[PDB]
């Protein structure tokens, strides 16, 4: 008769959830990647054959764990910096004298403490209108978010450079990497490869668009857990990047005042030259062709209908505009200059300029309070990046029309990393296995 036998080190796996860790390359960075374990120049990657695995990025726990890890890293990075709670005072703001955005900047003066608690000082500084709100409702003002939570100034020594970090799994577990051509968010993967650690995932922070992200290999990829549902975010991946360049013409001069014992506060001293508005540039031909390709690829999911783009849904400035992290400065660009066109079934530089605004007080994770005061960057600052993904959002009413409206929104921070972790999933290998055969042990 048949008998059962146990097999050790058998090649099977099951879905599970584990705690990953950083594996960046060879601390002062905002992500503290130097403290984590070093990377491996030759990653352990083994190809597979005749294997099918059900992938679902919308249900994996890697993005939810990465979001918490990034939040913890950010909180621990801003913890040892100087607290700016005594600065919540009354500011007597006037205009910028119109040196010639001559209205955005405001020249404010206020009282402040110093090294000696007995003595005080009066200093002047330049601030943006977006970070200033009136208190008397009509001369004198008060900072924004100051009435809700304390202000913390980011340490000028740290850098906000999105250096890549490698996410590895502990022993006894493996990461399944999918290499299928044109693989969307869900569906079974035929070309599966096993790797010990993820690739160069760059934790870039952006919204309404993706910068310095991954790209497709053959055609435009559209991802959504439910394309028929308008409430679901439609993440689209580009096959080729769209270059974008930005510049901040305001030649800033950073000054410093020592408030309290030892710690100091950095502000803007004076602007060299004429006041100018910060903006960004993008080629019209490249963006137009990209929009045409995206509309053509998205037309399949909604039949032979016309596609129309709108300029956001309105509301808060942080959820209706862009958000950059170029050199530590945060830019809020007006996206209305891009998603303004219509497309039909039938179908020189001339770059498109995008006006952008800058805010020193920010809360990237949209949490209630705990805002961070970004110190001003001295001198002119330039930035260049590649556009790889668009965070579209379906909008419609009766839905029986011949046209559809797509607005760039989403406003979810987890959607940024979800566009890069679509090829991975964590599994738990079970070396113990049983199978029947014909043999009997000795006695």
């Amino acid at each position: 008769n048949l008998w059962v036998t146990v097999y050790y080190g058998v090649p099977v796996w099951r879905d599970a959830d584990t705690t990953l860790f950083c594996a960046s390359d060879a601390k002062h960075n905002v992500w503290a990647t130097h403290a984590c374990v070093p990377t491996d120049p030759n990653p352990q990657e083994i190809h597979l054959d005749n294997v099918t695995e059900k992938f679902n990025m919308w249900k994996n726990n890697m993005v939810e764990q990465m979001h918490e890890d990034i939040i913890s890293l950010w909180d621990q990075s801003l913890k040892p910096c100087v607290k700016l709670t005594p600065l919540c005072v009354t500011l007597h703001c006037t205009n910028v004298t119109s040196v010639n955005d001559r209205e955005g900047l405001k020249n404010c003066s206020f009282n402040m403490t110093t090294e000696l608690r007995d003595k005080r000082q009066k200093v002047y500084s330049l601030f943006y209108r977006l970070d200033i709100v009136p208190i008397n409702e009509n001369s004198e003002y008060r900072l924004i978010n100051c009435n809700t939570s304390a202000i913390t100034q980011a340490c000028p020594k740290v850098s906000f450079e999105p250096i890549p970090i490698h996410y590895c799994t502990p022993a006894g577990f493996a990461i399944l990497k999918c290499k299928d051509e044109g693989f969307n968010g869900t569906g079974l993967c035929k070309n599966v490869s096993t790797v010990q650690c993820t690739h160069g995932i760059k934790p870039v922070v952006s919204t309404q668009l993706l910068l310095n992200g991954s790209l497709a290999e053959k055609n435009i990829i559209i991802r959504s857990e439910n394309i028929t549902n308008n409430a679901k975010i439609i993440i689209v991946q580009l096959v080729q990047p769209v270059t974008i360049k930005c510049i901040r013409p305001n030649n800033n001069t950073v000054k410093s005042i020592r408030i309290g014992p030892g710690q100091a506060f950095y502000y803007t001293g004076d602007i060299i030259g004429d006041i100018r508005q910060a903006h960004c540039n993008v080629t019209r031909s490249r963006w137009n062709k990209t929009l045409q390709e995206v509309a053509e690829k998205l037309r399949t999911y909604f039949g032979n209908k016309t596609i129309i783009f709108a300029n956001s849904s309105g509301g808060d400035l942080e959820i209706t505009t862009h958000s950059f992290n170029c050199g530590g400065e945060f830019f809020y660009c007006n996206t209305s200059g891009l998603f303004n066109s219509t497309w039909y079934v039938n179908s020189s530089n001339d770059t498109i300029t995008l006006p952008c605004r800058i805010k020193q007080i920010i809360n990237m994770w949209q949490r209630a309070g705990q805002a961070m005061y970004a110190p001003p960057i001295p001198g002119v600052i330039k930035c260049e990046s590649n556009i790889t993904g668009l965070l579209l959002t379906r909008d419609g009413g009766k839905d029986n029309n011949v046209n559809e409206t797509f607005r760039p929104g989403g406003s979810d921070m987890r959607d940024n990393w979800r566009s890069e972790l679509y090829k991975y999933k964590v599994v738990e290998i079970e070396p113990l296995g049983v199978a029947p055969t014909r043999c009997k042990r000795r006695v």
Partner: antibody, heavy 132, light 105 residues
């Protein structure tokens, strides 16, 4: 140059009252201290009052302590001095002056103290006199 | 209170003649003192920024010196104008008292 004028002087009766006004332009009036001085015939110039940027913590000399009052209007960019219980020897050409260094910097209790100033701009003083 | 003393009260001069004006301080004022010039019928104007500093807008011909309690206003009198009453005022003091006033012609 900085424009500074004053007016409001005229004849008065001993023991009565009189009000003076000083106008300023061409500079941030809400960022500099203001002082009042007199010029008697023969005797040199004598300082009689001072005022900070905010308006409070007024300073006065012993010869006019409790008799004169100084005030200013930041919104109107004007300075005023009130005279009460004036006597015969109070006649002189009252000049409206402005300090050179601003009030920005370290301070003890008022943004303008702890700093040593000196009069820079002197307006065209008005004559105030009394008689029987 | 503190009070200044300036001498000589009056002295005659001419174009190119060498003269000098000085003032003394009863208490120590280190170097907090400024000089002023005032023509008859015209408001006084600053002349000396600090004990060893010259006020802006004033010609380089004028100069001065002094420290502690004795200060002397060096005037070569080469220029034909500015023959008015010169005042020595001591700042850094409660009454910011001025000098007696010295006129040169």
């Amino acid at each position: 140059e900085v424009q500074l004028v004053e007016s409001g002087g005229g004849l008065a009766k001993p023991g009565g009252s009189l009000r003076l006004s000083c106008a300023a332009s061409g500079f941030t009036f809400s960022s500099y201290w203001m002082n009042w001085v007199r010029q008697t015939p023969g005797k040199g110039l004598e300082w009689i009052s001072a005022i900070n940027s905010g308006g409070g913590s007024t300073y006065y000399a012993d010869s006019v302590k409790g008799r004169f009052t100084i005030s200013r209007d930041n919104s109107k960019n004007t300075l005023s001095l009130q005279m009460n219980s004036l006597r015969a020897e109070d006649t002189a050409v009252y000049y409206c002056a402005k300090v050179d260094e601003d009030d920005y910097g370290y301070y003890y209790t008022v943004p303008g103290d702890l700093k040593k100033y000196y009069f820079d701009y002197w307006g065209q003083g008005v004559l105030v006199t009394v008689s029987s | 209170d503190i009070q200044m003393t300036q001498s000589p009260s009056s002295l005659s001069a001419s174009v190119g003649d060498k003269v000098t004006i000085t003032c003394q301080a009863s208490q120590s004022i280190s170097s907090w003192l400024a000089w002023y010039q005032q023509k008859p019928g015209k408001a006084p104007k600053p002349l000396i920024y600090k004990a060893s500093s010259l006020e802006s807008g004033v010609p380089s011909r004028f100069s001065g010196s002094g420290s502690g309690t004795d200060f002397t206003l060096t005037i070569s009198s080469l220029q034909p104008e500015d023959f008015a009453t010169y005042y020595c005022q001591q700042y850094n003091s409660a009454p910011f008292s001025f000098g007696q006033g010295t006129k040169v012609e």
